[PDB]
Amino acid sequence: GSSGSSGSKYQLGMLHFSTQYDLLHNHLTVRVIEARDLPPPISHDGSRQDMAHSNPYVKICLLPDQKNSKQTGVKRKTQKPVFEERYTFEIPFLEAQRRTLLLTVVDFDKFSRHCVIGKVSVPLCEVDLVKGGHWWKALIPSGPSSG
């Protein structure tokens, strides 16, 4: 029970990620991939700020659980955050299917307020984890949730 989005497209950007579940280890293997088309460090507004480079980072989480969130190391001044790191999560397939892979892209810096650039949610119910996942999505403008 929440509002939707309809109108001016969202040119927030795009993030690369792959969702694969390991049967041998019986855990969720979520490897974080690089990204591109990410907006500069801005609070209110302002075109491509000059000489504006910070240390961005990507977070991880498995909905509906939005408490135990993970985060990749902090890279050096760069527009395209790339880590190519792998992660694990002891979760029973049965649950996995019900759970959802959500990735949040937030910048890290002194005056780096909680102005997340965008998020990317994807249900692991349809996708085949046992076989692994790998696609490209366009970050969406997160919003309020009463659930």
PDB file of C-alpha atoms in Angstrom:
ATOM      1  CA  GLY A   1       0.000   0.000   0.000  1.00  0.00           C
ATOM      2  CA  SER A   2       2.145   2.846  -1.309  1.00  0.00           C
ATOM      3  CA  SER A   3       2.181   5.532  -4.002  1.00  0.00           C
ATOM      4  CA  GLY A   4       3.649   4.982  -7.454  1.00  0.00           C
ATOM      5  CA  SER A   5       5.664   6.815 -10.098  1.00  0.00           C
ATOM      6  CA  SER A   6       4.386   8.254 -13.379  1.00  0.00           C
ATOM      7  CA  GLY A   7       5.757  11.145 -15.414  1.00  0.00           C
ATOM      8  CA  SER A   8       9.196  12.553 -16.194  1.00  0.00           C
ATOM      9  CA  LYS A   9      11.501   9.551 -16.560  1.00  0.00           C
ATOM     10  CA  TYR A  10      14.174   8.999 -13.911  1.00  0.00           C
ATOM     11  CA  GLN A  11      17.701   9.665 -15.167  1.00  0.00           C
ATOM     12  CA  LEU A  12      19.226   8.760 -11.801  1.00  0.00           C
ATOM     13  CA  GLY A  13      21.636   6.256 -13.316  1.00  0.00           C
ATOM     14  CA  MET A  14      22.398   2.540 -13.479  1.00  0.00           C
ATOM     15  CA  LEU A  15      24.123   0.007 -11.225  1.00  0.00           C
ATOM     16  CA  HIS A  16      25.599  -3.391 -12.087  1.00  0.00           C
ATOM     17  CA  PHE A  17      24.950  -6.356  -9.793  1.00  0.00           C
ATOM     18  CA  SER A  18      24.644 -10.146  -9.895  1.00  0.00           C
ATOM     19  CA  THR A  19      22.504 -12.348  -7.651  1.00  0.00           C
ATOM     20  CA  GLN A  20      23.503 -16.005  -7.356  1.00  0.00           C
ATOM     21  CA  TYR A  21      22.744 -18.617  -4.697  1.00  0.00           C
ATOM     22  CA  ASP A  22      25.242 -21.354  -3.841  1.00  0.00           C
ATOM     23  CA  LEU A  23      23.652 -24.769  -3.304  1.00  0.00           C
ATOM     24  CA  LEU A  24      26.886 -26.398  -2.135  1.00  0.00           C
ATOM     25  CA  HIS A  25      27.300 -23.823   0.635  1.00  0.00           C
ATOM     26  CA  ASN A  26      23.543 -23.322   0.969  1.00  0.00           C
ATOM     27  CA  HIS A  27      23.936 -19.541   1.133  1.00  0.00           C
ATOM     28  CA  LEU A  28      23.242 -16.407  -0.909  1.00  0.00           C
ATOM     29  CA  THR A  29      26.241 -15.177  -2.900  1.00  0.00           C
ATOM     30  CA  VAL A  30      25.719 -11.522  -3.811  1.00  0.00           C
ATOM     31  CA  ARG A  31      28.714 -10.092  -5.665  1.00  0.00           C
ATOM     32  CA  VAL A  32      28.798  -6.300  -5.973  1.00  0.00           C
ATOM     33  CA  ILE A  33      29.678  -5.009  -9.439  1.00  0.00           C
ATOM     34  CA  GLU A  34      30.815  -1.598 -10.676  1.00  0.00           C
ATOM     35  CA  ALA A  35      28.405   1.058 -11.945  1.00  0.00           C
ATOM     36  CA  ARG A  36      28.102   4.193 -14.077  1.00  0.00           C
ATOM     37  CA  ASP A  37      25.931   7.214 -14.868  1.00  0.00           C
ATOM     38  CA  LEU A  38      25.936   8.376 -11.246  1.00  0.00           C
ATOM     39  CA  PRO A  39      25.146  11.985 -10.244  1.00  0.00           C
ATOM     40  CA  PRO A  40      27.692  14.151  -8.383  1.00  0.00           C
ATOM     41  CA  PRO A  41      27.601  14.976  -4.647  1.00  0.00           C
ATOM     42  CA  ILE A  42      24.728  17.454  -4.400  1.00  0.00           C
ATOM     43  CA  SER A  43      22.251  18.334  -1.651  1.00  0.00           C
ATOM     44  CA  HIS A  44      19.596  20.610  -3.148  1.00  0.00           C
ATOM     45  CA  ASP A  45      20.541  20.949  -6.818  1.00  0.00           C
ATOM     46  CA  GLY A  46      23.219  22.021  -9.279  1.00  0.00           C
ATOM     47  CA  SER A  47      24.486  20.724 -12.614  1.00  0.00           C
ATOM     48  CA  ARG A  48      27.684  18.676 -12.837  1.00  0.00           C
ATOM     49  CA  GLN A  49      29.624  20.423 -10.070  1.00  0.00           C
ATOM     50  CA  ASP A  50      33.205  21.264 -11.037  1.00  0.00           C
ATOM     51  CA  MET A  51      36.044  19.506  -9.216  1.00  0.00           C
ATOM     52  CA  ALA A  52      33.554  17.384  -7.276  1.00  0.00           C
ATOM     53  CA  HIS A  53      34.925  13.929  -6.464  1.00  0.00           C
ATOM     54  CA  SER A  54      34.030  11.844  -3.409  1.00  0.00           C
ATOM     55  CA  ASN A  55      34.235   8.256  -2.165  1.00  0.00           C
ATOM     56  CA  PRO A  56      30.878   6.657  -3.069  1.00  0.00           C
ATOM     57  CA  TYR A  57      29.765   3.202  -1.935  1.00  0.00           C
ATOM     58  CA  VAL A  58      27.019   0.632  -2.506  1.00  0.00           C
ATOM     59  CA  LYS A  59      24.901  -1.025   0.182  1.00  0.00           C
ATOM     60  CA  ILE A  60      23.152  -4.401   0.273  1.00  0.00           C
ATOM     61  CA  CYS A  61      20.029  -5.815   1.917  1.00  0.00           C
ATOM     62  CA  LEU A  62      17.435  -8.583   1.619  1.00  0.00           C
ATOM     63  CA  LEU A  63      13.863  -7.314   1.925  1.00  0.00           C
ATOM     64  CA  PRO A  64      11.550  -7.174   3.515  1.00  0.00           C
ATOM     65  CA  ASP A  65      14.364  -7.163   6.074  1.00  0.00           C
ATOM     66  CA  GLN A  66      15.751  -3.622   5.991  1.00  0.00           C
ATOM     67  CA  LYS A  67      17.755  -3.744   9.221  1.00  0.00           C
ATOM     68  CA  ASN A  68      20.907  -5.800   8.656  1.00  0.00           C
ATOM     69  CA  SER A  69      22.287  -3.841   5.702  1.00  0.00           C
ATOM     70  CA  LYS A  70      25.784  -4.367   4.298  1.00  0.00           C
ATOM     71  CA  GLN A  71      28.206  -1.982   2.592  1.00  0.00           C
ATOM     72  CA  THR A  72      31.282  -2.348   0.385  1.00  0.00           C
ATOM     73  CA  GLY A  73      34.624  -0.742   1.174  1.00  0.00           C
ATOM     74  CA  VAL A  74      35.226   2.939   0.476  1.00  0.00           C
ATOM     75  CA  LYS A  75      36.872   3.762  -2.852  1.00  0.00           C
ATOM     76  CA  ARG A  76      38.939   6.857  -3.637  1.00  0.00           C
ATOM     77  CA  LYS A  77      37.663   9.978  -5.398  1.00  0.00           C
ATOM     78  CA  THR A  78      35.862   8.506  -8.408  1.00  0.00           C
ATOM     79  CA  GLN A  79      32.608   8.801 -10.353  1.00  0.00           C
ATOM     80  CA  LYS A  80      32.253   5.101 -11.162  1.00  0.00           C
ATOM     81  CA  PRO A  81      32.368   3.071  -7.920  1.00  0.00           C
ATOM     82  CA  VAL A  82      33.958  -0.316  -8.605  1.00  0.00           C
ATOM     83  CA  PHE A  83      34.797  -2.966  -6.010  1.00  0.00           C
ATOM     84  CA  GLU A  84      33.956  -6.333  -7.568  1.00  0.00           C
ATOM     85  CA  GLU A  85      33.671  -7.924  -4.124  1.00  0.00           C
ATOM     86  CA  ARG A  86      31.717 -11.042  -3.157  1.00  0.00           C
ATOM     87  CA  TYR A  87      29.464 -11.541  -0.134  1.00  0.00           C
ATOM     88  CA  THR A  88      27.655 -14.399   1.606  1.00  0.00           C
ATOM     89  CA  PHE A  89      24.421 -14.745   3.577  1.00  0.00           C
ATOM     90  CA  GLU A  90      23.223 -17.877   5.372  1.00  0.00           C
ATOM     91  CA  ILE A  91      19.642 -18.036   4.103  1.00  0.00           C
ATOM     92  CA  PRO A  92      17.400 -21.018   3.246  1.00  0.00           C
ATOM     93  CA  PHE A  93      16.339 -21.118  -0.404  1.00  0.00           C
ATOM     94  CA  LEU A  94      12.674 -21.315   0.595  1.00  0.00           C
ATOM     95  CA  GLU A  95      13.110 -17.913   2.241  1.00  0.00           C
ATOM     96  CA  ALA A  96      15.346 -16.505  -0.495  1.00  0.00           C
ATOM     97  CA  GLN A  97      12.513 -16.833  -3.011  1.00  0.00           C
ATOM     98  CA  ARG A  98      10.369 -14.770  -0.641  1.00  0.00           C
ATOM     99  CA  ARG A  99      13.174 -12.303   0.075  1.00  0.00           C
ATOM    100  CA  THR A 100      14.184  -9.542  -2.339  1.00  0.00           C
ATOM    101  CA  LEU A 101      17.616  -8.237  -3.333  1.00  0.00           C
ATOM    102  CA  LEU A 102      17.743  -4.465  -2.860  1.00  0.00           C
ATOM    103  CA  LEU A 103      20.811  -2.309  -3.500  1.00  0.00           C
ATOM    104  CA  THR A 104      21.167   1.291  -2.325  1.00  0.00           C
ATOM    105  CA  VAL A 105      23.729   3.756  -3.674  1.00  0.00           C
ATOM    106  CA  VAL A 106      24.723   6.398  -1.127  1.00  0.00           C
ATOM    107  CA  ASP A 107      27.701   8.760  -1.225  1.00  0.00           C
ATOM    108  CA  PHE A 108      30.156   8.990   1.673  1.00  0.00           C
ATOM    109  CA  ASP A 109      31.717  12.290   2.739  1.00  0.00           C
ATOM    110  CA  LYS A 110      31.841  14.939   5.466  1.00  0.00           C
ATOM    111  CA  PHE A 111      28.766  16.832   4.269  1.00  0.00           C
ATOM    112  CA  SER A 112      27.366  13.638   2.746  1.00  0.00           C
ATOM    113  CA  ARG A 113      23.787  13.785   4.024  1.00  0.00           C
ATOM    114  CA  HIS A 114      21.382  10.863   3.632  1.00  0.00           C
ATOM    115  CA  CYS A 115      20.535  11.910   0.075  1.00  0.00           C
ATOM    116  CA  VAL A 116      20.744   8.430  -1.448  1.00  0.00           C
ATOM    117  CA  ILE A 117      20.989   8.630  -5.236  1.00  0.00           C
ATOM    118  CA  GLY A 118      18.683   5.681  -5.833  1.00  0.00           C
ATOM    119  CA  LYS A 119      17.801   2.071  -5.054  1.00  0.00           C
ATOM    120  CA  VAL A 120      17.319  -1.162  -7.001  1.00  0.00           C
ATOM    121  CA  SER A 121      14.979  -3.933  -5.858  1.00  0.00           C
ATOM    122  CA  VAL A 122      14.592  -7.325  -7.536  1.00  0.00           C
ATOM    123  CA  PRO A 123      12.529 -10.373  -6.491  1.00  0.00           C
ATOM    124  CA  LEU A 124      14.495 -13.622  -6.291  1.00  0.00           C
ATOM    125  CA  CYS A 125      11.288 -15.604  -6.790  1.00  0.00           C
ATOM    126  CA  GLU A 126      11.242 -15.626 -10.593  1.00  0.00           C
ATOM    127  CA  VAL A 127      14.988 -15.376 -11.211  1.00  0.00           C
ATOM    128  CA  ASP A 128      16.964 -18.620 -11.018  1.00  0.00           C
ATOM    129  CA  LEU A 129      19.450 -18.331  -8.154  1.00  0.00           C
ATOM    130  CA  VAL A 130      20.775 -21.880  -8.493  1.00  0.00           C
ATOM    131  CA  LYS A 131      21.832 -20.791 -11.979  1.00  0.00           C
ATOM    132  CA  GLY A 132      22.808 -17.277 -10.941  1.00  0.00           C
ATOM    133  CA  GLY A 133      21.705 -13.814 -11.998  1.00  0.00           C
ATOM    134  CA  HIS A 134      23.233 -10.916 -13.917  1.00  0.00           C
ATOM    135  CA  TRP A 135      21.482  -7.923 -15.479  1.00  0.00           C
ATOM    136  CA  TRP A 136      21.409  -4.123 -15.628  1.00  0.00           C
ATOM    137  CA  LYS A 137      18.831  -1.878 -13.959  1.00  0.00           C
ATOM    138  CA  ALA A 138      18.224   1.860 -13.607  1.00  0.00           C
ATOM    139  CA  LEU A 139      18.217   3.175 -10.037  1.00  0.00           C
ATOM    140  CA  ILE A 140      14.795   4.438  -8.962  1.00  0.00           C
ATOM    141  CA  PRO A 141      13.750   7.387  -6.759  1.00  0.00           C
ATOM    142  CA  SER A 142      13.188   5.816  -3.340  1.00  0.00           C
ATOM    143  CA  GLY A 143      10.163   6.925  -1.342  1.00  0.00           C
ATOM    144  CA  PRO A 144       8.207   6.588   1.923  1.00  0.00           C
ATOM    145  CA  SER A 145       6.879   3.215   3.072  1.00  0.00           C
ATOM    146  CA  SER A 146       4.321   2.443   5.779  1.00  0.00           C
ATOM    147  CA  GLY A 147       5.020  -1.282   5.884  1.00  0.00           C
TER     148      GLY A 147
END
